[PDB]
C-alpha cells in the first residue's frame, strides 16, 4: 500500500518463525532497535504489528 495509508497486520497467538528474515536475499536494510536481530527466535512477545 501507499505510505500515507500503510497496511497494519496484527500478529498474535502464533509460533513466531523468523526464518524468512534470515533466508531472504532481497533485504537491503535490516535495522533493529531495542532487540538483537539474531535473537528474535529466543524471545516471547505480547503482540506484534507488521
Amino acid at each position: 500500500a501507499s505510505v500515507y495509508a500503510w497496511n497494519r497486520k496484527r500478529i498474535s497467538n502464533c509460533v513466531a518463525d523468523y526464518s524468512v528474515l534470515y533466508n531472504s536475499a532481497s533485504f537491503s536494510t535490516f535495522k533493529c532497535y531495542g532487540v538483537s536481530p539474531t535473537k528474535l527466535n529466543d524471545l516471547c512477545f505480547t503482540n506484534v504489528y507488521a
Binding site: 531495542g34 538483537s36 535473537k39
Partner: protein
C-alpha cells in the same frame, strides 16, 4: 504502643530493607529493570550500555 522506641527501630530497618529491594525494579534509564531480559534480547555491545 508502649514500646514505640523499640518498634521504631524494627520499622525503620524493615522500611530501609524494603526500599532496597524495591529499587531492583527500577530501570534507571535502561530498557528493562531485569538483567536477564537485557541479556536475552541484546548483543554484548548494546547490552553493556
Amino acid at each position: 504502643s508502649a514500646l514505640g522506641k523499640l518498634q521504631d527501630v524494627v520499622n525503620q530497618n524493615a522500611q530501609a530493607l524494603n526500599t532496597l529491594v524495591k529499587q531492583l525494579s527500577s530501570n534507571f534509564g535502561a530498557i528493562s529493570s531485569v538483567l536477564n531480559d537485557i541479556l536475552s534480547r541484546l548483543d554484548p555491545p548494546e547490552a553493556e550500555v
